[PDB]
Chains A and B, each alone.
Chain A
Amino acid sequence: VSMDDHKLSLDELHRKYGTDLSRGLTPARAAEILARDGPNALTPPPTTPEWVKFCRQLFGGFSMLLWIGAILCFLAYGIQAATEEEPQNDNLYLGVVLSAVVIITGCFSYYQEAKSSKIMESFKNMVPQQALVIRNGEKMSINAEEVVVGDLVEVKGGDRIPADLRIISANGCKVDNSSLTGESEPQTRSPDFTNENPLETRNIAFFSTNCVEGTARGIVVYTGDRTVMGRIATLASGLEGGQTPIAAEIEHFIHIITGVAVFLGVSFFILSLILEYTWLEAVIFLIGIIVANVPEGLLATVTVCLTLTAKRMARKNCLVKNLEAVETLGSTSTICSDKTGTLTQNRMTVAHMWSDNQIHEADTTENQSGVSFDKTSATWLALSRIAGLCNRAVFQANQENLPILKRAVAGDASESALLKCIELCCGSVKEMRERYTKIVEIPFNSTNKYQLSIHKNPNTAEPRHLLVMKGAPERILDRCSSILIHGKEQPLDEELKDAFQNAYLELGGLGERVLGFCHLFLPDEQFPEGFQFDTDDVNFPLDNLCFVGLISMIDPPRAAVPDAVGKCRSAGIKVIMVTGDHPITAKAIAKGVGIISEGNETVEDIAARLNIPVSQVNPRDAKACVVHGSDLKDMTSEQLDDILKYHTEIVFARTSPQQKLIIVEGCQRQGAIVAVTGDGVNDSPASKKADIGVAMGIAGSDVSKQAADMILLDDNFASIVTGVEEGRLIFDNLKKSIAYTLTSNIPEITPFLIFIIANIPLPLGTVTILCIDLGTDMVPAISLAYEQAESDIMKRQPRNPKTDKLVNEQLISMAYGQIGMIQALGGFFTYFVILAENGFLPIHLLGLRVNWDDRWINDVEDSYGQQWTYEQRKIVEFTCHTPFFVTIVVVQWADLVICKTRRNSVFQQGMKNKILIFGLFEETALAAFLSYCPGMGVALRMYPLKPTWWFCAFPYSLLIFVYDEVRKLIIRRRPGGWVEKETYY
């Protein structure tokens, strides 16, 4: 169905789109087209589903079971009205309460959904994308929404293609189609058309794809809504999975809980049939048990956690795409960091140089006045010539009246620094671009590690084209066969290579990036003037070049970085630098920001100290280490495993992007969760494979900021730290609540089982059970979410998902075998005191149901020889049920402040949460209000309480309080742990 005009020639493209091959478009015209077609962002869907979506959430589980139970209650009440005459309210009330619970739950989940979606919507507009258009002959980095149809647009590697373009000029440009093809493989891009099909041809770039490598420039054939790709981004697109660790353990818990609640359910239904209860009562009992063992609250709780973390991330500017991933970030036991742009601020100005076996400097003040060595030397003229010609960046439009240091530049940090330094120290770079006409070009690739240009011979005595090339100083040193000395060539010596290395140490030691520079006055006889040049095929010799010299600029880390690394290494998170920059530079930066600490010598430092060859030094004797990319290339999986495992502080240097990838994968080969922080396009493969990816929103590329799970809109590295901290809290808070809810279960289930063992009068009722499970688990389980991380300071190092989850099998042992049991024996005690206080000694109480539950036998005798009627001893009964509710409410206090803190005693945590206190007080108020309102003895069978009955419960709750802090004090004193290994949440 797609149509196109790609077949149309560049001059027919000229006439059709009235633009310019290189001069770009008129600003006036660009505003006219902007006013004509409107912003080039796809008109969004509806919303799509509005607030009616809340209905589904109101319908859905876990409340679904509450809904089935409620409708089963109303059904039961209808059946009870039909059969026999029944004054009792029974269910009815029950189904009402259940429905109300569901509705309230829905309000919660919808509220937290509202906050979370407001945040996630603000995050989309916090950072707008941008496009590099060409207008008035000059380049502009304008907003991505302001690109018009038919203006020229450049798209270096690492950028998203801002609209659908017809490539009129490109070099080595491999774009990634990704979504349009479904293929991860990059596809080359040239001005020539190859297929009638617009999707497969190479002259057509399209929206929502990104240029992996090389450079290109094209006229915008399609803007905004009506782009070739613009149909699938809304007509079929959506959220595409899949799994999230914390959420996965969440669902696993849900399946487990469902399983136990239904097993107990049917089991207690057969017990009901053996108890000879009526079906009308047996189903209500079933509903009771199920609604009991199943935490409604886990869901709303989770939503709470998510929303909270979202607010907190909103406050420190770090965007997270996937909320759950924040937890993943906490679980990180190894951060892999790129150096330039990441640990550093990717802002640079040239400080030092090296030519003619001499160290020169460039003044950085104002000034710049950077020579300071010899403005007249010829070797500086060649150096400056390379630095200017080989540089691809230029100043942005309307920037000429500003100081060179202070004007806006379109290019990477290195080339920008060069640009400013030549434009200031020597002369106008643009003028020397125009002087030395660039005939053919090689794009810059990280993979390639170098960049070079071939320009004409404007000089009268250069009787041929001139090649220039800058890059990794070592590749340059390799490729050369001679060096310029005072303007006169001279082959490479041992002396020259030694001075090169010594100067590289001297300048790299200051943590300065060391760009190497060389050139080649090509042999005349070898080629004529109109010789065809080949970028795809290497027709041009890269060897035997003429070395010129070195240039270095100071690279300052961001302020927060050393502190961040400090916190993470304080966090038991291994910090590992992975850069393709200089081995010496990355070592220095590492020492600086604390990836490598003093006193931890590398093998080479040891070889220096001990005056012995590096190979003689025991590699295990060594703490830290730096790995050269070349060594990495020849690494077996096993040897990387070794380096990674046996060395504490690790810095990878000279690494290819795939080597970043393999590094991360080696960290994943250890079983460890890894984070990846970066900026560059070449970070993307590394930050993809990661368990959690982080990228600069400013300094980052479009590809790597796409790929990442977390974007720092403020470029603040420290945001990672709080990030992981949040992720602990989530993993921490959730677990806490879980603990609490389970402790509610045992004392709800036990009475029906003790019921079987001896004919002991009913200690609680179904209505009493739901009373507990609703008053005692709605508010509190949610309130747990609001607690801050105790100490928490983890380090204690992040726990393996394999070691312990959100639902530890150990958690259930002190949740059921410890707390639950106590709440239970408390309940049974209070019940025995009630029944004792009414003439029925506890010893007398077993064997009673035989006549107790018997309706027509009113001759029941107690220990004091009193004859009780059915309705009297039943009143007594419901007055034993009522406190069991109240009493567990009393004991649930303890559990709340116990689950409030996992680590340090509840005194070190503080009271903090108002929702927790709110939970205590409104739990108690619900108890009271349930027991003393009129008609409650009839409605929910809740007969009012004798004052003493409230006090009965206390001892046990105190046993809880004491025990768990005897516990927490044992954690405190010893980490060896006996219970740490048995009763840790």
Chain B
Amino acid sequence: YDYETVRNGGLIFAALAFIVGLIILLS
């Protein structure tokens, strides 16, 4: 439960987490 929704949320999250990683890494 459910589908699409948490997949999307997790997806945008992974994206933000990763962008944050690069951002902090390039500081």
Q: Which residues of A contact B (CB under 8 A)?
A: 914-915, 917-918, 921-922, 924-925, 928-929, 931-932, 944-947
Please determine whether A947 and B6 come into contact, CB atoms closer than 8 angstroms. Answer: yes
Assembly CA distance A470 to B6 (angstroms): 91
Chain A residues closer than 8 Å to B13, beta-carbon distance: 928
Please determine whether B6 and A944 come into contact, CB atoms closer than 8 angstroms. Answer: yes
A889 to chain B, nearest CB (A): 11
Chain B residues closer than 8 Å to A931, beta-carbon distance: 10
Please determine whether B17 and A922 come into contact, CB atoms closer than 8 angstroms. Answer: yes
Chain B residues closer than 8 Å to A944, beta-carbon distance: 6-7, 10
Please determine whether A921 and B6 come into contact, CB atoms closer than 8 angstroms. Answer: no
Chain A residues closer than 8 Å to B18, beta-carbon distance: 921-922, 925, 929
Q: Is the interface of A mostly helix, strand, loop or mixed?
A: helix
A771 to chain B, nearest CB (A): 15
A768 to chain B, nearest CB (A): 17
The residue of chain B having its C-beta at the shortest distance from the C-beta of A932 within the complex is B10
- Decide yes or no: A925 and B10 within 8 Å by CB, A914-B27, A946-B1 being known contacts: no
B27 to chain A, nearest CB (A): 6
B6 to chain A, nearest CB (A): 6
A934 to chain B, nearest CB (A): 8
Chain A residues closer than 8 Å to B25, beta-carbon distance: 914-915, 918
Chain B residues closer than 8 Å to A929, beta-carbon distance: 14, 18
Assembly CA distance A947 to B10 (angstroms): 9
Given A928-B14, A932-B11, list of 8 further CB < 8 A pairs? A918-B21, A921-B20, A922-B21, A925-B18, A928-B13, A932-B6, A932-B7, A947-B6
Chain A residues closer than 8 Å to B14, beta-carbon distance: 925, 928-929, 932
Q: Is the interface of B mostly helix, strand, loop or mixed?
A: helix
Please determine whether B21 and A945 come into contact, CB atoms closer than 8 angstroms. Answer: no
Please determine whether B20 and A946 come into contact, CB atoms closer than 8 angstroms. Answer: no
Assembly CA distance A932 to B20 (angstroms): 19
How many chain B residues touch the partner (CB < 8 A)? 15
Assembly CA distance A914 to B13 (angstroms): 20
The residue of chain B having its C-beta at the shortest distance from the C-beta of A949 within the complex is B6
0/1 interface trace, chain B 1-27, chain A, CB 8 Å (1 if under)? 100001101110110011011001101
A304 to chain B, nearest CB (A): 15
Assembly CA distance A676 to B14 (angstroms): 54
Please determine whether A928 and B10 come into contact, CB atoms closer than 8 angstroms. Answer: yes
A-B contact count (CB 8 A): 43
Assembly CA distance A944 to B2 (angstroms): 10
Q: 7 smallest A-B Cβ distances: which pairs?
A: A932-B10, A925-B17, A928-B14, A925-B18, A922-B21, A921-B21, A929-B14
- Decide yes or no: A928 and B24 within 8 Å by CB, A944-B6, A945-B10, A946-B1 being known contacts: no
B21 to chain A, nearest CB (A): 4
The residue of chain B having its C-beta at the shortest distance from the C-beta of A927 within the complex is B14
Tell me which of B6, B13, B14, B20 has the highest count of chain A C-beta atoms within 10 A of its own C-beta: B14
Chain A residues closer than 8 Å to B6, beta-carbon distance: 932, 944-947
B24 to chain A, nearest CB (A): 5
Please determine whether B17 and A921 come into contact, CB atoms closer than 8 angstroms. Answer: yes
Assembly CA distance A921 to B6 (angstroms): 19
Assembly CA distance A922 to B24 (angstroms): 11
Chain A residues closer than 8 Å to B1, beta-carbon distance: 946
- Give 23 A-B contacts (CB < 8 Å), ordered by A residue: A914-B24, A914-B25, A914-B27, A917-B24, A918-B25, A921-B17, A921-B18, A921-B21, A922-B17, A922-B18, A922-B21, A925-B17, A925-B21, A928-B10, A928-B11, A928-B17, A929-B18, A932-B7, A932-B10, A944-B6, A944-B7, A945-B6, A946-B1
Please determine whether B24 and A918 come into contact, CB atoms closer than 8 angstroms. Answer: yes
Assembly CA distance A557 to B19 (angstroms): 54
B13 to chain A, nearest CB (A): 6
Contact of A924 among B9, B17, B24 (CB under 8 A): B17
The residue of chain B having its C-beta at the shortest distance from the C-beta of A917 within the complex is B24
A476 to chain B, nearest CB (A): 67
Chain A residues closer than 8 Å to B20, beta-carbon distance: 921
Chain B residues closer than 8 Å to A946, beta-carbon distance: 1, 6
Assembly CA distance A521 to B12 (angstroms): 99
The residue of chain B having its C-beta at the shortest distance from the C-beta of A934 within the complex is B7
A584 to chain B, nearest CB (A): 57
Chain B residues closer than 8 Å to A932, beta-carbon distance: 6-7, 10-11, 14
Chain B residues closer than 8 Å to A947, beta-carbon distance: 6, 9
The residue of chain A having its C-beta at the shortest distance from the C-beta of B10 within the complex is A932
Assembly CA distance A876 to B2 (angstroms): 14
Assembly CA distance A924 to B25 (angstroms): 15
The residue of chain B having its C-beta at the shortest distance from the C-beta of A928 within the complex is B14
A354 to chain B, nearest CB (A): 66
The residue of chain B having its C-beta at the shortest distance from the C-beta of A916 within the complex is B24
The residue of chain B having its C-beta at the shortest distance from the C-beta of A944 within the complex is B7
A340 to chain B, nearest CB (A): 48
Assembly CA distance A51 to B24 (angstroms): 31
B22 to chain A, nearest CB (A): 9
Assembly CA distance A929 to B16 (angstroms): 11
Tell me which of A914, A915, A924, A928 has the highest count of chain B C-beta atoms within 10 A of its own C-beta: A928
Chain B residues closer than 8 Å to A914, beta-carbon distance: 24-25, 27
Assembly CA distance A917 to B13 (angstroms): 16
Tell me which of B9, B17, B18 has the highest count of chain A C-beta atoms within 10 A of its own C-beta: B17
A956 to chain B, nearest CB (A): 21
Assembly CA distance A931 to B7 (angstroms): 9
Assembly CA distance A726 to B24 (angstroms): 26
Assembly CA distance A915 to B25 (angstroms): 7
Chain A residues closer than 8 Å to B9, beta-carbon distance: 947
Assembly CA distance A914 to B9 (angstroms): 26
